[PDB]
Amino acid sequence: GAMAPSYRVKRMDIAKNDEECVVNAANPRGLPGDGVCKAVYKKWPESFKNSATPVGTAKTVMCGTYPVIHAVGPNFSNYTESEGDRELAAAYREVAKEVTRLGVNSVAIPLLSTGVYSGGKDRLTQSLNHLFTAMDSTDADVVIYCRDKEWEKKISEAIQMRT
Ligand SMILES: [Cl-]
Ligand SMILES: [Cl-]
């Protein structure tokens, strides 16, 4: 574990992370996809061998010795708010199990279902709270990666609020 497990947020490409593993915002089919998923495909294409997995699950594939945890959040275009919320919380619980199993001291993680799977809604708080619910009991340093300054500010505030 990390000596003093923390949360941090950085505004930059998760493909350039400084952590011991990465969480992909994957699609269920292991396709290159869009946004975070396409950046992860460019950086770690070998990790997309048999990475297909259902919504609400995570499947880890090694790129060399670097673990890529493919976490499939729900596409809120297709799910009801209620069912989408359940699957989004489930995907993060599976990430916590994988991070634990791998024995890493740090993990780079995007906010699941906040981009092209958001169904056009702002899900920063929903997604981040499900991330905390899953990851709080883990002792890995968690580094959240986002794109926009206003998201960075809100995520930072939410982390600092808990202390
Ligand atoms: Cl960048
Ligand atoms: Cl997304």
Coordinates of C-alpha atoms and ligand atoms in Angstrom, one line a residue:
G1 CA 0.0 0.0 0.0
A2 CA 0.9 3.7 -0.1
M3 CA 2.4 5.0 3.2
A4 CA -0.3 7.7 3.4
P5 CA -3.0 6.8 0.9
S6 CA -4.3 9.9 -0.8
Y7 CA -6.5 11.2 -3.6
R8 CA -5.3 13.8 -6.1
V9 CA -6.6 15.2 -9.4
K10 CA -4.6 16.2 -12.5
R11 CA -5.8 17.9 -15.7
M12 CA -3.9 16.0 -18.4
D13 CA -4.1 12.9 -20.6
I14 CA -4.3 9.7 -18.4
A15 CA -2.2 8.1 -21.1
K16 CA 0.7 10.2 -19.6
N17 CA 0.0 9.1 -16.0
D18 CA 2.7 8.6 -13.3
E19 CA 1.0 5.7 -11.5
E20 CA 1.6 1.9 -11.4
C21 CA -1.6 1.1 -13.3
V22 CA -4.4 2.7 -15.3
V23 CA -8.2 2.4 -15.4
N24 CA -9.6 2.6 -18.9
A25 CA -13.1 4.0 -19.4
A26 CA -13.8 1.1 -21.7
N27 CA -16.6 0.0 -23.9
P28 CA -18.0 -3.5 -23.4
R29 CA -16.5 -4.8 -26.7
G30 CA -12.9 -4.0 -26.2
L31 CA -13.1 -1.5 -29.2
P32 CA -10.6 1.4 -29.5
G33 CA -13.6 3.7 -28.9
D34 CA -13.5 7.5 -28.3
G35 CA -12.0 9.9 -25.7
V36 CA -10.1 8.3 -22.8
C37 CA -10.6 4.8 -24.4
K38 CA -9.0 5.9 -27.7
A39 CA -6.0 7.5 -25.8
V40 CA -5.6 4.2 -23.8
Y41 CA -5.8 2.2 -27.1
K42 CA -3.0 4.4 -28.7
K43 CA -0.7 4.0 -25.5
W44 CA -1.4 0.4 -24.6
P45 CA -3.0 -1.4 -27.6
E46 CA -1.7 -4.8 -26.4
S47 CA -4.0 -4.5 -23.4
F48 CA -7.1 -4.7 -25.7
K49 CA -6.5 -8.5 -26.3
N50 CA -9.7 -10.1 -24.9
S51 CA -10.6 -7.0 -22.9
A52 CA -14.3 -7.2 -23.8
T53 CA -16.4 -7.4 -20.5
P54 CA -20.0 -6.5 -19.5
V55 CA -21.3 -3.2 -18.2
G56 CA -20.6 -2.8 -14.5
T57 CA -17.4 -4.9 -14.6
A58 CA -13.7 -4.5 -14.8
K59 CA -11.2 -6.7 -16.6
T60 CA -7.5 -6.3 -16.3
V61 CA -5.1 -7.0 -19.2
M62 CA -1.3 -6.4 -18.9
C63 CA 0.6 -4.3 -21.5
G64 CA 4.0 -5.7 -20.8
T65 CA 3.9 -5.7 -16.9
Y66 CA 1.8 -2.5 -16.8
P67 CA -1.8 -3.3 -15.9
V68 CA -4.7 -1.8 -17.8
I69 CA -8.0 -2.2 -15.8
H70 CA -10.8 -2.0 -18.4
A71 CA -13.8 -0.6 -16.4
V72 CA -17.1 -0.5 -18.3
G73 CA -19.4 2.2 -17.0
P74 CA -23.0 2.3 -18.3
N75 CA -24.0 4.5 -21.3
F76 CA -26.8 6.7 -19.8
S77 CA -28.2 7.1 -23.4
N78 CA -29.3 3.4 -23.0
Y79 CA -29.8 2.9 -19.2
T80 CA -32.5 4.5 -17.0
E81 CA -31.1 6.8 -14.3
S82 CA -31.7 4.2 -11.6
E83 CA -30.2 1.2 -13.5
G84 CA -27.3 3.4 -14.8
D85 CA -26.5 4.6 -11.3
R86 CA -26.4 0.9 -10.0
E87 CA -24.0 -0.2 -12.9
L88 CA -21.8 2.9 -12.4
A89 CA -21.3 2.1 -8.7
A90 CA -20.7 -1.6 -9.6
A91 CA -18.0 -0.8 -12.2
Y92 CA -16.1 1.2 -9.5
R93 CA -16.5 -1.6 -6.9
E94 CA -14.8 -4.0 -9.5
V95 CA -12.0 -1.5 -10.0
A96 CA -11.3 -1.5 -6.3
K97 CA -11.1 -5.3 -6.3
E98 CA -8.7 -5.3 -9.2
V99 CA -6.5 -2.5 -7.8
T100 CA -6.4 -4.6 -4.5
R101 CA -5.6 -7.9 -6.3
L102 CA -2.8 -6.3 -8.3
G103 CA -1.0 -5.1 -5.2
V104 CA -0.2 -1.7 -6.8
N105 CA 0.6 1.4 -4.6
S106 CA -1.0 3.8 -7.1
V107 CA -3.7 3.9 -9.8
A108 CA -4.7 6.5 -12.5
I109 CA -8.5 6.7 -12.9
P110 CA -10.9 8.7 -15.1
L111 CA -14.5 9.6 -14.0
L112 CA -16.5 6.7 -15.6
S113 CA -19.7 7.6 -17.6
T114 CA -18.9 11.4 -17.6
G115 CA -18.1 11.9 -21.3
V116 CA -19.8 10.2 -24.3
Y117 CA -21.6 7.8 -21.9
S118 CA -23.1 10.7 -19.8
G119 CA -26.3 10.9 -21.9
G120 CA -25.5 14.6 -22.1
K121 CA -25.7 15.2 -18.3
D122 CA -23.1 16.5 -15.9
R123 CA -22.2 13.5 -13.8
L124 CA -19.0 14.8 -12.0
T125 CA -20.5 14.5 -8.5
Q126 CA -22.4 11.2 -9.2
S127 CA -19.3 9.5 -10.7
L128 CA -16.8 10.9 -8.2
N129 CA -18.9 9.8 -5.2
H130 CA -19.2 6.3 -6.6
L131 CA -15.4 6.3 -7.1
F132 CA -14.9 7.3 -3.4
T133 CA -17.4 4.7 -2.2
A134 CA -15.3 2.0 -3.9
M135 CA -11.8 3.3 -3.4
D136 CA -12.0 4.7 0.2
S137 CA -11.2 1.2 1.7
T138 CA -8.2 0.7 -0.7
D139 CA -4.7 1.9 0.3
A140 CA -3.5 2.8 -3.2
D141 CA -2.7 6.4 -4.0
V142 CA -5.5 7.4 -6.4
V143 CA -4.9 10.0 -9.1
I144 CA -8.0 11.2 -11.0
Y145 CA -7.4 12.5 -14.5
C146 CA -9.7 15.1 -16.1
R147 CA -9.7 17.4 -19.2
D148 CA -11.3 20.7 -18.1
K149 CA -10.1 23.4 -15.6
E150 CA -13.7 23.7 -14.1
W151 CA -13.8 19.9 -13.6
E152 CA -10.3 20.0 -12.0
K153 CA -11.4 22.7 -9.6
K154 CA -14.6 20.9 -8.6
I155 CA -12.8 17.5 -8.1
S156 CA -10.1 19.2 -6.1
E157 CA -12.7 20.9 -3.9
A158 CA -14.5 17.6 -3.3
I159 CA -11.2 15.9 -2.3
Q160 CA -10.1 18.8 0.1
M161 CA -13.7 19.0 1.7
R162 CA -13.2 15.4 3.1
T163 CA -9.8 16.9 4.3
Ligands
CL1 CL -1.9 16.5 -21.7
CL2 CL -17.6 8.2 -20.8

